[PDB]
Amino acid sequence: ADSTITIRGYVRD
Amino acid sequence: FACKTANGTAIPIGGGSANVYVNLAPVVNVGQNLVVDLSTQIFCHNDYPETITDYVTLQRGSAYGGVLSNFSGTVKYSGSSYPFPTTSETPRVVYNSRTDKPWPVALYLTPVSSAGGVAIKAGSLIAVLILRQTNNYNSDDFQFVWNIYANNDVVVPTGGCDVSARDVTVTLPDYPGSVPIPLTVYCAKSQNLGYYLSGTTADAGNSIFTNTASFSPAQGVGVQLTRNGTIIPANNTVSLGAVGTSAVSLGLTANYARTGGQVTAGNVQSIIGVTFVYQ
Ligand SMILES: CCCCCCCO[C@H]1O[C@H](CO)[C@@H](O)[C@H](O)[C@@H]1O
């Protein structure tokens, strides 16, 4: 790949 | 005749070799990509300019090293461009002043992709340049060998286009929510450009990317990207139209997306690959 996107997130309760 | 470098090493009269450590700022130019301009890094001088004239050439065998050796390029020596690695000694450059003057060498890379790049680790050998010095006085024939090392981690672009960032990380709000992905692209000259996404997906639509978080992964959720509200499946070329020297945004927004079953608390993570293509 020419570029790589890293998406971070959380689910809380 | 002797030479100095900016990073603090020198080769005396008679020739020899020296290590040159350079900060790399590779950029795309039209038809060729700049790797490093050494004319601000290496300087030479004549020790008897009033009576003797030194002739300086880029000797043959000058090549890229490390990973870049797999690529063909060009080299600009005092205004004219020649094939690199050099298979032939370049024409002479006259040297006649006690003041240290640049060795006008700049290494370029022939484009092979659209927006591709190659990773260079710091401390890597990136080139071996050979300076041959002679004169009009005696029969002197000396070699100055320059081992060019990368001072920093960089990506040398191998295409006619470049991205704002090779590796991006964005953080979503706590579920549910979304967030823009700041990511743009520009080209050395005008190109009809497009890109497509890569990654592991959970849906038949091939658009919802799997949660591959290592610790406490939240279940039932994945990531799905949109542009103007439209979902973007993997391996489907998104057309950007003409992209020039002005940076054009990919218009990507990351969103959460349900995979299947109960949504439980935990971390979310998805790595998505972007590849550009000419249209
Ligand atoms: C009997 C005086 C002749 C002079 C001797 C100086 C030696 O010349 C040095 O400097 C010359 C350039 O200034 C070079 O051509 C030569 O290779 C060497 O680096």
Numbering used by the authors:
A (entry chain B): 2 to 14
B (entry chain A): 1 to 279
Q: What does the report in the manuscript say about this coordinate set?
A:
The adhesin FimH at the fimbrial tip specifically binds in a catch-bond mode to terminal α-D-linked mannoses of N-linked glycans of the receptor uroplakin 1a on urinary epithelial cells. FimH is a two-domain protein, composed of an N-terminal, mannoside-binding lectin domain (FimHL) and a C-terminal pilin domain (FimHP). FimHP possesses an incomplete immunoglobulin-like fold that is completed by insertion of an N-terminal donor strand of FimG, the subsequent subunit in pilus assembly. The two-domain architecture of FimH is a prerequisite for catch-bond formation because the interactions between FimHL and FimHP determine the conformational state and ligand-binding properties of FimHL.
We had shown previously that FimHP also accepts the donor strand of the non-cognate subunit FimF (DsF). However, FimHP is slightly less stabilized by complementation with DsF than with the natural donor-strand DsG30. We hypothesized that such complementation with DsF instead of DsG could also result in a mild destabilization of the interdomain interface in full-length FimH. We then determined the co-crystal structure of FimHK12·DsF with HM (FimHK12·DsF·HM) at 3.0 Å resolution with four molecules in the asymmetric unit. Three FimHK12·DsF·HM molecules closely resembled the Abound state (r.m.s.d. of 0.6 Å to FimHF18·DsG·HM) with a preserved interdomain interface. In the fourth molecule, however, the FimHL and FimHP domains were separated and they adopted a drastically different relative orientation with an angle between the domains of ∼45° instead of ∼150° in the other three molecules. Remarkably, in the bent fourth molecule, no interactions between FimHL and FimHP other than the direct covalent linkage are detected, equivalent to a breakdown of the total 500 Å2 interdomain interface of the Abound state. This molecule thus represents a third state, the domain-Separated, ligand-bound state of FimH, Sbound. The complete absence of non-covalent interdomain interactions indicates that the Sbound state does not possess a defined relative domain orientation in solution, and that the observed, kinked conformation has been selected only by crystal packing. In this Sbound state, FimHL adopts a conformation closely resembling isolated FimHL with bound ligand.
